[PDB]
Paper text:
pmcThe BEN (BANP, E5R, and NAC1) domain is a ∼100-residue protein domain found in metazoans and viruses, but missing in nematodes and urochordates. There are nine BEN domain–containing transcription factors in the human genome, i.e., BANP, BEND2-7, and NAC1/2. The BEN domain-containing transcription factors regulate transcription by recruiting chromatin-modifying factors to specific chromatin regions via their DNA-binding BEN domains.
To further investigate the role of cytosine methylation in BEN domain binding, we successfully obtained the structures of the BEND6 BEN domain in complexes with the CGCG motif and CGmCG motif containing DNAs, respectively. Our binding results also revealed that the BEN domain of BEND6 exhibited comparable binding affinities to the methylated and unmethylated CGCG motif DNA sequences with Kd of ∼39 μM and ∼33 μM, respectively. In the BEND6-CGmCG structure, two BEND6 BEN domain molecules bound to a DNA duplex in an asymmetric unit. The two BEND6 molecules could be superimposed very well, and they bound to the DNA in roughly the same binding mode. For instance, both BEND6 molecules used N262, N261, and S217 to make hydrogen-bonding interactions with the bases of C3, G5’, and G8 of the DNA, respectively, although N262 of the BEND6 molecule 1 formed a water-mediated interaction with the base of C3, while N262 of the BEND6 molecule 2 formed a direct interaction with the base of C3. Moreover, we found that the binding mode of the CGmCG DNA to the BEND6 BEN domain was very similar to that observed in the BEND6-CGCG DNA complex. Similar to the BEND6-CGCG DNA structure, R254 interacted with the base of G7’ in one molecule and interacted with the DNA backbone in the other molecule. In both structures, the last six amino acid residues (K266 to K271) after the helix α5 are disordered.
Residue numbers in the entry:
A (entry chain B): 174 to 265
B (entry chain A): 174 to 264
Amino acid sequence: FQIEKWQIARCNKSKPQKFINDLMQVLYTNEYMATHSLTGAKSSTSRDKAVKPAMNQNEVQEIIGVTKQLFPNTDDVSIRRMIGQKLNNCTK
Amino acid sequence: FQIEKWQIARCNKSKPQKFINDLMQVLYTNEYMATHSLTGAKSSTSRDKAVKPAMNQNEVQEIIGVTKQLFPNTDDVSIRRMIGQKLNNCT
DNA sequence: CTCTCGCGAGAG
DNA sequence: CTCTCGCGAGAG
């Protein structure tokens, strides 16, 4: 699993969160992003509810590497939160 | 309100979050940080308990300014989240 | 305390 | 859709 330049060409380059919003939209359906989390962990505030399965960690790490290449001043922890932010803003 | 170099000098320079954690512990008591949020916004979740009041926004901008001088490639909004993380760290 | 991290309101 | 930003479990 390898993100290509033609996928990267379609994505806002002004800001990392904007790049992530565009790239996730190129790679994934809305239904997929609404039903998965970054890590598959239970939310501290979800009691006795379905736990969303994790993204493919190979796809996560490719997403992070491509983002890091275009945004050298963003770091691992920030890009992870940004992928989570996009996933959190998708509804079934 | 101005942050002095003697306060900056007591702080980890390796990572912005470590710097912010050190800097805020030099400026504020644990109990102050325990009981404030960055902006004083009402929780999206716990709507019953009293709302933690905001930090002083002048102090916030002086912290972001001093952070930005040492970590010029960290953006303003990340620094705001890091100030938030450290307040949360005191709860 | 510290970090990571899924979630939510409510206003753009 | 998109952002800011507070809660809070669990492992460290």
